[PDB]
Symmetry: C3
Subunit: 39 residues, 3 copies
């Protein structure tokens, strides 16, 4: 089904986001911890 | 409808992203402002 | 089709994310490079 093809794309799309988002969030907080913490 | 279940999941998925994205963006610019601004 | 309207919204939604995500990622790594690199 065409609609399903679309839905499935979005899920692959969406999944990719979840990772990218987690990564960014970690780096961020980390760099912030890497600053606050020690010099 | 199964397809709708899928579509609705994606919206919940997608909504979650919008928040996470806004938050990250704020922290970022902020930390950048917290650097440029004063020491 | 209502379902399609929904699917299309999500794609516009999803597309918007991809940009916002790329931008954030660049700023991040950049600020990190702007720190490591020189003072």
């Amino acid at each position: 089904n065409i609609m399903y093809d679309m839905i499935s794309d979005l899920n692959e799309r969406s999944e990719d986001f979840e990772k990218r988002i987690v990564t960014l969030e970690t780096k961020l907080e980390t760099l912030i911890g890497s600053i606050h913490a020690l010099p």
